[PDB]
Amino acid sequence: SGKHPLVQAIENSQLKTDLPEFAPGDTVVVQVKVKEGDRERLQAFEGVVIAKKNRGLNSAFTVRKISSGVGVERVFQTHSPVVAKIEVKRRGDVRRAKLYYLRDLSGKAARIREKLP
RNA sequence: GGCCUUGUACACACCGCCCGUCACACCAUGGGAGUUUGUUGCACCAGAAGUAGCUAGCCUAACUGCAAAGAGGGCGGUUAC
């Protein structure tokens, strides 16, 4: 709430009301809507959350994964309608908010310990 | 000019035989700044399926228990090769 009240009021009418709770270090599956011509489908993007920005309507989160030996990161905009659904598959145990150090690790070294209730 | 003997790689028989460089044509081959293929010795990194060990997170038909739940099993995690 660092913006003017009118801007806050305009942003508040667009907020999603069903996002789950998730934190950096988790692994999530994001369903993205893909539109080809008139063909609508859902595509899954599964990976580790390495960064999360909490800014209301301007909230975002970064997901990193390995695809056919190539690392790929996508910075999803949380409240965009393109993100159909977010599932939390596993909860991780980390010590910091941003996990950019995972970019320099591979395979076993990049494993994240599971957070145990 | 004639006879005997001797040496010879000459026998078309010394107008013999025959050697090497240079020039010409062909053939195989050695060396050579480098270029490139296969294979291999170490040293390290990464590492699947699989097997062996340890775990206690989760889930559970046959057994035990009046039942609560145990035993056993499975998934997961993890170490070695």
Q: What torsion, rounded to 10 degrees, do the Cα atoms A93, A85, A76, A110 define?
A: 30
**SS3 label, residue A28:** strand
Can you name the residues that pair with A65 across neighbouring β-strands? A72
Domains: count for chain A: 1
Nucleotide nearest to A117 (CA to C1'): B57
Query: Cα separation of A83 and A68, whole Å?
Result: 23
For strand B, give the nucleotides within 7 A of a protein CB. 46-47, 57-58, 77-79
> Which residue's structure tokens are 């990049």?
A110
Residue A60 belongs to domain spanning: 1-117
Method: cryo-EM
Listed in order, strand segments (DSSP E) in chain A are 27-36, 39-53, 60-67, 70-77, 83-90
- Determine whether the distance from the CB of A108 to the nearest atom of strand B is below 7 Å: yes
Q: For A85-116, give the secondary structure using H, E and C.
A: EEEEEECECCCCCCCHHHHHCCHHHHCCCECC
